[PDB]
Amino acid sequence: ELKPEQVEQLKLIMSKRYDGSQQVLDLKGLRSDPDLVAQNIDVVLNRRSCMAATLRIIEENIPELLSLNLSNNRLYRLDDMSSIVQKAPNLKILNLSGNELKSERELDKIKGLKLEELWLDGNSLCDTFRDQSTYISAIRERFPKLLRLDGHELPPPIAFDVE
């Protein structure tokens, strides 16, 4: 566990990485963060307790959060951040690229998020599909309201039962 002093430091570093205007929290490669490294604080987000401390700080400080970038954090399983639907209710953009997610099922653990944009490129789960087509389906399955995927805009959801 991070001592109170360290949590305050993390709080500070996250605060520096938060863009009130865009309402984006950039937690990319958090481990190798300069300030964190400088003060010898090792935040390993793919470790329960750390994702927890991080999430608590998001819950208690930027509840209105809309965009969260967790790219490049060796995240291999999303269940450790499942309570996020609870903490960042308003979240609508999530960047999970460059992590170590081997399957798209990992996404069932955060299924409650009403994501409009998501990134998964850089995850081995990617070379698990054979065509951008199946891939998009598999993913829209968890987030139907998804508007953009991996940077590319997506065709408005074709509902079969129209009239």
Which residue ranges make up the site for its own copies (CB under 8 A)?
82-87, 89, 109-112
Q: Quote the tokens at residue 17.
A: 């990485």
CB of 108 to its own copies, least distance (A): 9
Q: Which of residues 16 and 111 has its CB atom nearest to its own copies in the complex?
A: 111
Give the three-state DSSP class for 84. Answer: helix
CB of 89 to its own copies, least distance (A): 7
CB of 96 to its own copies, least distance (A): 16
Residue type (1 letter), 160: F
Contacts of 114 (CB under 8 A, 6+ apart): 92, 143, 145
- CA atoms of 39 and 59, how far apart (whole Å): 24
Q: Which of residues 108 and 121 has its CB atom nearest to its own copies in the complex?
A: 108
Q: Which of residues 10 and 36 has its CB atom nearest to its own copies in the complex?
A: 10
DSSP state of 72: S
CB of 41 to its own copies, least distance (A): 22
Q: Quote the tokens at residue 77.
A: 């399983």
